[PDB]
Amino acid sequence: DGEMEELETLWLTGICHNEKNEVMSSQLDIDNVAGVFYMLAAAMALSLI
Amino acid sequence: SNGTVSPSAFLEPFSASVWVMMFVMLLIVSAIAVFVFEYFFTIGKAIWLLWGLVFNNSVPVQNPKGTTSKIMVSVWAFFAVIFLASYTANLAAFMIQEEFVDQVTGLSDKKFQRPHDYSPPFRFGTVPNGSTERNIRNNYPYMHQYMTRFNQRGVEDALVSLKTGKLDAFIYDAAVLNYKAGRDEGCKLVTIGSGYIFATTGYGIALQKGSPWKRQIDLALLQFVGDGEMEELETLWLTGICHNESSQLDIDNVAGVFYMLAAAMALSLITFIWEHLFYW
Amino acid sequence: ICTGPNDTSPGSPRHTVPQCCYGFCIDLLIKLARTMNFTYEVHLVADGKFGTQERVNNSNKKEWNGMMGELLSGQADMIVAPLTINNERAQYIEFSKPFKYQGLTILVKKEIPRSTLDSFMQPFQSTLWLLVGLSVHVVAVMLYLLDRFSPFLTLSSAMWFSWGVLLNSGIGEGAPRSFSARILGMVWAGFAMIIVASYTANLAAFLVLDRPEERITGINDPRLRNPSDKFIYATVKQSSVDIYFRRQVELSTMYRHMEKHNYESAAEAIQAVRDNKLHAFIWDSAVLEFEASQKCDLVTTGELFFRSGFGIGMRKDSPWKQNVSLSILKSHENGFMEDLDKTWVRYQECDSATLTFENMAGVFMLVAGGIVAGIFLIFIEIAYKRH
Amino acid sequence: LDRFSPFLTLSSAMWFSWGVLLNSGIGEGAPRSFSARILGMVWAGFAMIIVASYTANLAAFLVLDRPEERITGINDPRLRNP
Ligand SMILES: *[C@@H]1O[C@H](CO)[C@@H](O[C@@H]2O[C@H](CO)[C@@H](O)[C@H](O)[C@H]2NC(C)=O)[C@H](O)[C@H]1NC(C)=O
Ligand SMILES: *[C@@H]1O[C@H](CO)[C@@H](O[C@@H]2O[C@H](CO)[C@@H](O)[C@H](O)[C@H]2NC(C)=O)[C@H](O)[C@H]1NC(C)=O
Ligand SMILES: *[C@@H]1O[C@H](CO)[C@@H](O)[C@H](O)[C@H]1NC(C)=O
Ligand SMILES: *[C@@H]1O[C@H](CO)[C@@H](O)[C@H](O)[C@H]1NC(C)=O
Ligand SMILES: *[C@@H]1O[C@H](CO)[C@@H](O)[C@H](O)[C@H]1NC(C)=O
């Protein structure tokens, strides 16, 4: 009859069950740009060679 | 409406005071600053160089021969690239923003009040033998007399008439129309004023005069509304999928830019003519 | 001319002062007196509380207080006020047809956005800025380091070329000559475009979806559901909202917070909300909406719940009830309550454009700082010319 | 304007305009008239506006591309009204 879902969402429910509801706006770290930085370093090395 | 109102382009992104101030005074001050650096070559050439490097790359112009002037134009070009990036981001956000429109607002609109003084007569009516018709007749007899021509038969008949286009407005009970709009597919039908209500009345359970059940019924209804049963009953029945929730832009969206450019080369042509007469 | 207590604060002598009352309820009462002719003598209740069934210190006795304490004791004959109708109030007195339909909701102080000075450089980390600057300097020096020893570009020329290509300006018109220098310049231009494109993308990401606290989803908000020390939310003590919170069983944990913090009147609560002392105020939709219309920096966000209406009550049996109900229903039928709503509720000044001047005043401040440092730079250039 | 200047052919002007629209950087189309240069400047600003609008509209188009509208279980509104 469906009382179980109501009772578990009234008692067993939690606050951490959203899991896909944060804007999480943030900056760019060093490691994220480290890829193109390493590409640039390799370009410099090949220019020298 | 077929096409909702489009929010103004390039007005929200930058304030007009900001527009004029950072297109006039900052440029004038920077030109005076760079000309003295170059002197220690021409005011006009420096102004043209700085204006060209404001927006983006153009045909190369003679670069300043002073190191401090080069520093100045570089720190200006940093502001230039941040201006370009911000002008991209703010239009992106403004594209993200939604849009909505209402055809008419309120019942006292002149379209309702005087349907005669319009090239197309305004089509509105209601089902007779109801509270809405009696209220309209008691308040505005002329409205009732006019709507008798565009009368309706039933609720579904009115909805299909609005869908086809035979009728323009349908006055009826707020709850019934709200339910119909919520359950309607495509949400092509909407209330005026974003839920505007005029009669602000309710539904009551009729009873015989002096009936002993009046007090008990009133107490039961108050108990139910105080224990919140009305809420889940409304969610079960009165909930509508339409309420409680611009891929591309056309030429008209950017028409202001095109017209500004039109005035731009018009001013350029008149400046050319003025220079020729001045030389003459 | 309405007589009332002078001081709302408890512990003070409440002398009956003859102030003057006006507004929605007063005009409604005047209209009712015009319909059926009867002289009215308006006075304010001694205690600002609306009146709830309260267990006095004397046990085994339920007592009505406030304006209902005035009315039920015979000290009043009719009440005109934004009084919420509920079961407890309907048990002891009979209410007329409601003159304003409304419901409970939440008012919160609107969080105006704050723009810092580092808004322009916000998307990139300070460490990222330092790294890209050091990379710029080292590559710029090694351009002419490689070009100088090429039998087949100087300090200033290579430096200005580097700044121009990383800056999308073109300040340095001198160009690399050796093939390795050409490839290096092309790759550096590509890296500069990648940097600027990623920076534009990060501005786009940060600018949009910028809301630190989304909203309160009515009463079902999990943050509102769980009481906490920082989230201090309250309502007017000893009123209809208190009765509704207490009686309905599931909400009783919320009631556990209620007695912790309360305010004597709605004015104190809204002042506390304005002064950021309260995080949320629970009150009637009409009052809070009017306050939001007037107090333009406060917003009503909670979903409308507990739908009811303001009613004018009298004693258990009164000859007025049928006639006053008929007259108020007639007033609803014609264009009268709409006029009151227009002239006392509807009017407003602001209720609530992007990237204003205050948003990134940092860029104009940086340009001004460059302008005022240009004199220092030219002085340094003159001093270098001296040497 | 350049032809009637008091003191660059048609193809050169065409290539100037095309390099304004798209930032190739070919240049080599510098006009000699005052009004011609200022018009090229303002037209370059307008070309920047056009390309920025293009980028913004493309971003707006490709950030949201969900026509599927995945069913949210039994709570989906489409289930209520078949
Ligand atoms: C509103 O009431 C009038 C009055 O009864 C209805 O008019 C009747 O309509 C039926 C069906 O067309 C006729 O058989 C009767 O002779 C009509 N009576 C009169 C007095 O004209 C009318 O149909 C009702 N309208 C609605 C929508 O219910
Ligand atoms: C409520 O209003 C009704 C309608 O006017 C009043 O009933 C009339 O009262 C007058 C004077 O008492 C009589 O002359 C009429 O014959 C009555 N008409 C009817 C249809 O009853 C009634 O007195 C009013 N009651 C109150 C308490 O104001
Ligand atoms: C557009 O307007 C017509 C009437 O001109 C109407 O029939 C139609 O429903 C409207 N909407 C669409 C999507 O065509
Ligand atoms: C009411 O109180 C105020 C200040 O508390 C005082 O100025 C005023 O005189 C008082 N009213 C009367 C009638 O004394
Ligand atoms: C006004 O009051 C008088 C008595 O004071 C009463 O006779 C009359 O019915 C009332 N209503 C009127 C005059 O409309």
Numbering used by the authors:
A (entry chain B): 785 to 833
B (entry chain D): 540 to 579, 599 to 803, 809 to 843
C (entry chain A): 435 to 586, 601 to 800, 806 to 840
D (entry chain C): 580 to 586, 601 to 675
What's written in the study?
Canonical N-methyl-d-aspartate receptors (NMDARs) are glutamate-gated glycine-dependent ion channels abundant in the central nervous system. Their activation results in excitatory currents that underlie synaptic plasticity, cognitive integration, and memory formation. Each heterodimer consists of an obligatory GluN1 subunit plus a homologous GluN2 or GluN3 subunit, such that functional receptors comprise two GluN1 and two GluN2/3 subunits. By comparison with previously determined structures and together with our results from kinetic modeling of fully liganded receptors, we propose that the gating reaction of GluN1/GluN2A NMDARs involves at a minimum these three conformations, referred to here as: primed (closed-pore, all M3 helices straight), engaged (closed-pore, only GluN2 M3 helices bent), and open (open-pore, all four M3 helices bent).
Whole-cell currents recorded from human embryonic kidney (HEK) 293 cells expressing M817VEM or ΔMEM receptors revealed large nondesensitizing currents and the ΔMEM receptors were constitutively active. The conformations of GluN1 in the pre-M1 region are identical in both primed and open structures, consistent with GNE-4123 stabilizing an expanded outer gating ring at the upper leaflet of the membrane and lowering the energy required to break the M3 helix. However, expansion of this outer gating ring is apparently insufficient to fully overcome the barrier to opening the pore, as our GNE-bound M817VEM construct was captured in a primed, closed-pore conformation. Therefore, we used the M817VEM structure as our reference. In the primed state, all four M3 helices are straight, and the passage of ions is prevented by three constrictions near the extracellular side of the membrane. We refer to these constrictions as the T3 and A7 gates within the SYTANLAAF motif and the VIVI gate located just above this sequence, at GluN1 V656 and GluN2A I654.
